[PDB]
Amino acid sequence: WVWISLYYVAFYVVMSGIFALCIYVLMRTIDPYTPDYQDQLKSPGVTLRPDVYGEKGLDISYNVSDSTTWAGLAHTLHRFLAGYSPAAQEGSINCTSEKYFFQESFLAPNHTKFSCKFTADMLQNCSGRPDPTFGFAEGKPCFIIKMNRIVKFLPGNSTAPRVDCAFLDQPRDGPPLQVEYFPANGTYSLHYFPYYGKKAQPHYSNPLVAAKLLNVPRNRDVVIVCKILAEHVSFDNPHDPYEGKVEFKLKIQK
Amino acid sequence: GMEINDHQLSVAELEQKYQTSATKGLSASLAAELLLRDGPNALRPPRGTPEYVKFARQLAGGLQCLMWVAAAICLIAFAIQASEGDLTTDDNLYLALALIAVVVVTGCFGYYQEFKSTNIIASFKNLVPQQATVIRDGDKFQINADQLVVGDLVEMKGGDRVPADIRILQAQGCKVDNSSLTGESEPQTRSPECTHESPLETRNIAFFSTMCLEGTAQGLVVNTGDRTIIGRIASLASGVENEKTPIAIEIEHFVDIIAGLAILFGATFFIVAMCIGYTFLRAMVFFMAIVVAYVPEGLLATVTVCLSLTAKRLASKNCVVKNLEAVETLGSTSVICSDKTGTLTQNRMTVSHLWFDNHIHSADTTEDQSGQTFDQSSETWRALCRVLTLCNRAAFKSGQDAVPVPKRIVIGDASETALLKFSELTLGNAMGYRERFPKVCEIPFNSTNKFQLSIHTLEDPRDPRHVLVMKGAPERVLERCSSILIKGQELPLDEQWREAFQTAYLSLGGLGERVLGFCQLYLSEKDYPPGYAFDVEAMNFPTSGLCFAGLVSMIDPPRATVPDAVLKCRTAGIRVIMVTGDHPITAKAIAASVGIISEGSETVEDIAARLRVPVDQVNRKDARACVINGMQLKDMDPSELVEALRTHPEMVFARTSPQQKLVIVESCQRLGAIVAVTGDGVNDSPALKKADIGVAMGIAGSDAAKNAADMILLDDNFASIVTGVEQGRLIFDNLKKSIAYTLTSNIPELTPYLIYITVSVPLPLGCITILFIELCTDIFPSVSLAYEKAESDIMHLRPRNPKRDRLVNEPLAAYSYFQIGAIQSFAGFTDYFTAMAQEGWFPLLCVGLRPQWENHHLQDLQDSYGQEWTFGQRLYQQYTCYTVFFISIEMCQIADVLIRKTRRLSAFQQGFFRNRILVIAIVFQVCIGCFLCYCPGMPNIFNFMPIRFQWWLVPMPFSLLIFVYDEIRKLGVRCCPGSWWDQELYY
Ligand SMILES: Cc1nc2c3c(ccn2c1C)[C@@H](O)[C@H](O)[C@H](c1ccccc1)N3
Ligand SMILES: *[C@@H]1O[C@H](CO)[C@@H](O)[C@H](O)[C@H]1NC(C)=O
Ligand SMILES: *[C@@H]1O[C@H](CO)[C@@H](O)[C@H](O)[C@H]1NC(C)=O
Ligand SMILES: [Mg+2]
Ligand SMILES: [Rb+]
Ligand SMILES: [Rb+]
Ligand SMILES: [Rb+]
Ligand SMILES: [Rb+]
């Protein structure tokens, strides 16, 4: 009765090896810098910090007089920005080209390329200094708006891409909102594009901007949609709401 | 009813009991009251059959049970996942819903089939109310049979169906046709003397359904309706509950394996779930997904169409079956119990043999006239044919010139109808022929004379002499014969011929045939000139010294195809026994005639007469045959029966009651036989119910025996049975071919889940997508396997052993699930990693990555390429994971469907394109495969999207590996079938 047992083993290990061969084939097949197909990257998505989610999407509601409601919001903003510090971001170089930056060749230890640099500095007030509540204690929160990285994706030589935030309706209800973004005009510089690899540029970080909300009334539920503005961006896809635009609910209480 | 002591009573006693008159009949008033009291003189059909409870049954048993449980589990899982909170659990609902839907729709398809077949059977039915000639208040009139009441006074004659159960009061040469109640193929004398105490055997009772042949009688109605011998015999058959069909029993065992495996996998991976760090709640909802994944969604639909296909092919040969399951039974069948009269025989007296020119001639007793007919060139033939054509009182009913000559309706009786149908066949146009020879004197069946004699003027005017024709019991013709036509001359009836006649009479009587003598005398136109007045009372014509013409003998001949059919079944290894109520001499006759008993076999009584030894000394083991009559069947206990039953292989039961017929089928089933009974009469209704398949004669069948039958031979062609075996044997082989295909795809569906469970990779295959596999793409290929031809000579194999040979055996599944399912899992997983590794995610990354993958908050997650996508963008990749795993199945299914063409043969031999219907189905399979992918809008509706053209090619080597690997299996099992390969690796 034992003889049958071996057979299933023989059979499986044959298939196992046959499969163990295809993995080894498939690993040597694929490039390590440029995406093999990247079929869902016709347009990129936009994340928001602090990322605090409700039942459906992003809802952020705190009380200015109550340090507890908004402490954890900055207590995620500060954590996130630890890599946007010169101490841990020195492993790359400063890029003031103000134009696209194409590296044909790899120049850094272990055959790597040069990355750009971006530190809290760029987000003037929304960097933790002089305000460690990042606008929140004032009732004027700063929200960081970073786009995802796609190898060799280009938004356009034309100008810099720029965020624009506003509400959904409520035209007559009150004033249209005013935000001051940092950097001013809310633009990501062109020299950060394109991405080339986790292995191609290990010490790399996404450029971002911040949105200091000025107009938002106290004690009122509002809704804001920080949508990127560029040519190679589409913020109109109904299947992916976080595609070149991010919405969030925000109520600031007093 | 009160039938026990009806006939034993006096007529003075009866008319007190039923307050009637034996002369004047039942008063009109009372006879009307009685009908209210007792109800109508008909039989209450099996009521209580609503249209909505016919459908409720269609969706129970076997797969029905499993699929309902599987569906219920899906809903409990939805509750547990709606307790802890799980989104797009729409999958749980769609699965549970598609389960219940397959079950329901299968149930409807079965409903029409059972409905449609019954209407087909209903149209081969007569709806003319039988009539009864009744006497009430001293007036005879025609009424409807159902209006008779216990106590009525009735009469009947040639051609009258017997209206009730009638105690005979006075009968004039009345014989009657008990072939439905008893087996009796010889007509039965009815008289008012008490022949027996059992109402069954006494000759003063006309039975409720029976048919008068000839003569006339009157009598009192004693039991009307369900209280008759017909009545209580079908009450019996209601009380018979029929056993579950063979095909159903295979499918129920099959489910004990699905269920058997479900649970072991559930338990082990529920153990793996707990052990790898899951909550009990989630370990258990996985456990549930595992058992549910073993249930095939489409197997129930794929199976019943296969049955519908063969039942359709069978319907086309006037073999209409009532339920779909019965299509298989004949192939499983190993014993056939069979009725004699009506089923085996035609139940219609035919002229079998004739003695003239000092030689016996054998006529063509086939109804299609396909047998061998006899020497009709003889001079004496033309003459003997004249005597039997003129001296015949009976007549065909008008306007039957279209209908075949044996099947015509004829007035009078069968002694005389057989002679009339014979003449129309041999001579042709008998009644018009005998108008050329006018009739001047006649003597019908007489008392003092005991013969039938009539005198006729010749046809042409050149011959003024008259011709006398006489027929009657053979010795009573010979005593009035001084001459004998022999071989072109007219010889004196000397002692040579007197001996020679007696030897032939006793020779044709030994076959138990009703034989009649015939003779003629030519009256001289000198003594008897044109217009000579003949006197019946006084003997002016001669009734002696006549010239003997010949003997003609008639019998109940077998149906044409029957002798052939029985043999073809025995070569299929199917034991044929004959259970009939007729007498043994007749029984053994037909059983020889057709094949039940083969040339050379003898019963213990035969050895005792050839060796001239008392029967006790004879070794029963030396008797290939045996007859057992019913009056001695009861004496043996069942341990005695099996002894004899397995001692003598060519068995015949004779003179057996309906209940005994039931006993025999029960005794055979009790020894593990798939037994089929084949029946016409109401003495088979009970026998036919208990049988695994009850076959009814479409035309000759009584209502009850059709109503208690699984199958019906619309044209009474018994050759249908032999095809029924072949088809039943075919689909059984073709079902396990087609089942083995459809259940391979379960494992490559579950491996994705198990891996998504254990390794926590992002979900490779979705529920919405397995449903398209099971319920859309693989049905047409599956059912096309019902089109395969027999690989071997199926009709020569023994009937499958129900104990060892099984539709789904332990090597059938273990081959399909774990071996080919593995090659399909590796094919699917190889295209899974390729899909993601080419799209940015390296395999090592996918290991454990799932939680972040499914996470609805991470909108920038990095691949192994560093890139960050959103949820929906990840979802769309997982849809490709679904979609590329889906086509990885399909490219193995095309390799798989072809693999199942032959279990033990090769495609280079048989043909890849052997049957059209599989190939047309494979083309269908890919067509929807390409429509599901490259149709616009697909990703939102169902989790399917346009794959890259190279991911189609990734699983194509594994399809070839499937091809090669089984091809070499089934190239090594047949070409070296010693022991090892056939045991573990044959299905
Ligand atoms: C074989 C298989 N089963 C599933 C499956 C899902 C997704 C993919 N699945 C695959 C590939 C879930 O959508 C469901 O929770 C579902 C389920 C069913 C019964 C009990 C508990 C859960 N099971
Ligand atoms: C905000 O917080 C302060 C102190 O916690 C409280 O007094 C005030 O009412 C709060 N506002 C609302 C709208 O709850
Ligand atoms: C940011 O800070 C600078 C000085 O630190 C100040 O001039 C400017 O007004 C601040 N921006 C906003 C929007 O308050
Ligand atoms: Mg019968
Ligand atoms: Rb745009
Ligand atoms: Rb399944
Ligand atoms: Rb013959
Ligand atoms: Rb039956």
Numbering used by the authors:
A (entry chain B): 37 to 290
B (entry chain A): 47 to 1033
Question: Which lines from the publication concern this structure?
Answer:
Therefore, we attempted crystallization in the presence of phosphate analog beryllium fluoride (BeF) and K+-competitive acid blocker (P-CAB) BYK99, a high affinity analog of SCH28080 with a fixed ring structure, which stabilizes the molecular conformation in a luminal-open but K+-bound E2P state (BYK·K+·E2BeF). The Lys791Ser (KS) single mutant structure in the BYK·Rb+·E2BeF form was analyzed at 3.4 Å resolution. In the single KS and double KS/ED mutants, the Rb+ density at the cation-binding site is weaker than that in the P-domain at higher contour levels, reflecting an unstable cation-binding site.
The gastric H+,K+-ATPase mediates electroneutral exchange of 1H+/1K+ per ATP hydrolysed across the membrane. Previous structural analysis of the K+-occluded E2-P transition state of H+,K+-ATPase showed a single bound K+ at cation-binding site II, in marked contrast to the two K+ ions occluded at sites I and II of the closely-related Na+,K+-ATPase which mediates electrogenic 3Na+/2K+ translocation across the membrane. One of the notable differences between HKA and NKA is the presence of Lys791 and its salt bridge partner Glu820 in HKA, which physically restrict K+-binding space at the site I position.
